Design a protein around this ligand. Structure first.
Ligand SMILES: *[C@@H]1O[C@H](CO)[C@@H](O[C@@H]2O[C@H](CO)[C@@H](O)[C@H](O)[C@H]2NC(C)=O)[C@H](O)[C@H]1NC(C)=O
Lengths: 270, 221, 46, 40
């Protein structure tokens, strides 16, 4: 925002919303940051606003400046003797003696290479995720397996709206696992009271790289469902929208986001 | 202008649908919708004595030499283990900061990447090196680097990933920079914009993009 | 007098049997610890 | 004899099978102690 007001030369003043969190069309009435811009008590709303079709009909969203989505985070789980004689050499006449010694030489190369290669095997050990993705059998059939599973999300958000409109039963299951904050979900997951937490992709990446240790991870190497963007809410049909977005494109071309994201969005865990 | 923008502004075209690189010059002359792609830029690269020596005064020497043989074979095991175990990285390569005739990095002539690198004069030497080896199409560069006539190729991430899936020798680098998107070029302010962007968003929201990736993007060779 | 020759040879490969078994296992971890020093000296590097 | 084998005609067959078991067990113990002491 400091970069924004610099080039278009507009004055402003901030204040905090008191009713709602991010916007919820209740009885046809929107609240939060979006609700005010509909009422035009404010001309711009800036923060963590998720671009979706439903919210694009009451306000206008400028070009997104950061890419995010919907993700799920889980805690990282922590003649008879002739064969006999030749058989012992591998497990550590004159011509008969010669055959034994050369066989021992082969055995030594066999055993020495066996231990050295085995040592390298434990060097590159890895782990795998327990769930394929959002369409997992334990997800589409929650609490339908020998071990009852548990997972939920914060209500009154964009992510909750998306779930209800694509998986009704899956949305209905999560009603008893609703959280109220980022920290509460992280701690409950740490305490084992919860098994999986679904929330915004951009912020859960931040918490993963800044958690105490690296106990909490996201599914896969980073998987995003329903890619979208974060946007700036503007009053409907504003004359600034042409100039508002043109500045954002100047930012990516020059490259200020790289430095800014390293300042705020960098992490510790890898 | 020329190319896609040269044809679109001439009126012979109406709506450019292609992997269009969104930049600042294009937004001034023509309109866009929400980008349908998410990726950055990277590089494509190509990849009794017999029983003792082997196992009364002479017996002391024999046992000493047996110990010598044991320590010698232990040392040989140690050195073979050391032999078998112990013995560019993006734009930040100093050898690419000041290139030579050996490291050959090239890009597409009259493409958005060349303009992007010309914008930042801090890579003027790179702009002074790529000018001698700009190729018309990505296929030409891929074929030339497959013949090992090239050594690097600054290009999009998704295209080079599909190419690496096709050809196992194709390898990418580490750096992922300039995270832009691909969108649908349009004419000037027209009613073919609002519903177009709404349709693109409605396609992104559901599993349609995943299905299209199953068709072409997700698949590996 | 011949116990020393037999005992030391077994380092490198009723009362008497028990004592050698402890000594051999002591030699077992001894050469095992020696291979660790080989690994330790490997990491070392005008 | 058995006490002399584990540390050093199905009878000797099982004996050599257990000898191979002992060799692989001691190899595994050596590998795990080396990994435990060198890397971490
Ligand atoms: C989502 O919105 C509803 C409605 O505002 C919240 O429910 C309210 O919760 C407060 C605090 O417990 C009560 O005082 C209100 O009476 C409740 N209203 C209704 C109609 O339920 C709900 O808490 C919000 N989501 C959360 C954070 O759980």
């Amino acid at each position: 925002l400091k970069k924004i007001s610099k080039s278009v030369k507009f004055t402003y003043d901030l204040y905090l919303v008191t009713n709602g969190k991010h916007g919820k069309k209740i009885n046809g009435t929107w609240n939060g940051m979006i609700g005010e811009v509909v009422m035009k008590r404010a001309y711009m709303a800036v923060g963590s606003l998720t671009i979706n079709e439903e919210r694009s009909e009451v306000v206008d969203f400028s070009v997104p400046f950061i890419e995010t989505g919907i993700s799920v985070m889980v805690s990282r789980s922590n003649i008879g003797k002739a064969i006999w004689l030749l058989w012992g050499l591998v497990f550590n006449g004159t011509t008969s003696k010669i055959m034994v010694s050369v066989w021992a030489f082969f055995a030594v190369i066999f055993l020495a290479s066996y231990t050295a290669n085995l040592a390298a095997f434990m060097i590159q050990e890895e782990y795998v995720d327990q769930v394929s993705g959002l369409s997992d059998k334990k997800f589409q059939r929650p609490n339908d397996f020998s071990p009852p599973f548990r997972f939920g999300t914060v209500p009154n958000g964009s992510t909750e709206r998306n779930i209800r409109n694509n998986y009704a039963e899956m949305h209905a299951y999560m009603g008893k696992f609703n959280q109220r904050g980022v920290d509460d979900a992280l701690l409950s997951l740490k305490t084992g009271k919860l098994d999986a937490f679904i929330y915004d992709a951009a912020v859960l990446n931040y918490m993963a790289g800044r958690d105490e240790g690296c106990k909490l991870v996201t599914i896969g190497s980073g998987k995003v469902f329903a890619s979208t963007g974060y946007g700036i809410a503007i009053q409907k049909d504003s004359g600034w929208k042409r100039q508002v977005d043109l500045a954002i494109l100047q930012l990516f071309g020059d490259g200020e986001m790289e430095e800014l994201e390293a300042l705020w969005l960098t992490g510790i865990c890898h | 202008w020329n190319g896609m923008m040269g044809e679109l502004l001439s009126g012979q075209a109406d709506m450019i649908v292609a992997p269009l690189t969104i930049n600042n010059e294009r937004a001034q002359y023509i309109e866009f919708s929400k980008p349908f792609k998410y990726q950055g830029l990277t590089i494509l690269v190509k990849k009794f004595s017999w029983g003792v020596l082997l196992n009364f005064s002479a017996r002391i020497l024999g046992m000493v030499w047996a110990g010598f043989a044991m320590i010698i074979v232990a040392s040989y095991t140690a050195n073979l283990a050391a032999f078998l175990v112990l013995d560019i990285t993006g734009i930040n390569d100093p050898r690419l900061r000041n290139p030579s005739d050996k490291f050959i990095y090239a890009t597409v002539k009259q493409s958005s990447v060349d303009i992007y690198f010309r914008r930042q004069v801090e890579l003027s030497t790179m702009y002074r090196h790529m000018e001698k080896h700009n190729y018309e199409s990505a296929a030409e560069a891929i074929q030339a680097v497959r013949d090992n006539k090239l050594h690097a190729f600054i290009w999009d991430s998704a295209v080079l990933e599909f190419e690496a899936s096709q050809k196992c020798d194709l390898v990418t680098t580490g750096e992922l920079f300039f995270r832009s998107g691909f969108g649908i070029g349009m004419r000037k302010d027209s009613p073919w914009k609002q519903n177009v962007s709404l349709s693109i968003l409605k396609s992104h929201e559901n599993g349609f993009m995943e299905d299209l990736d199953k068709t072409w993007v997700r698949y590996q060779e | 007098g011949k116990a020393i020759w037999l005992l030391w040879g077994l380092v490198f490969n009723t009362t008497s049997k028990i004592m050698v078994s402890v000594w051999a296992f002591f030699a077992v971890i001894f050469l095992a610890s020696y291979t660790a020093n080989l690994a330790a000296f490997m990491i070392q590097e005008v």
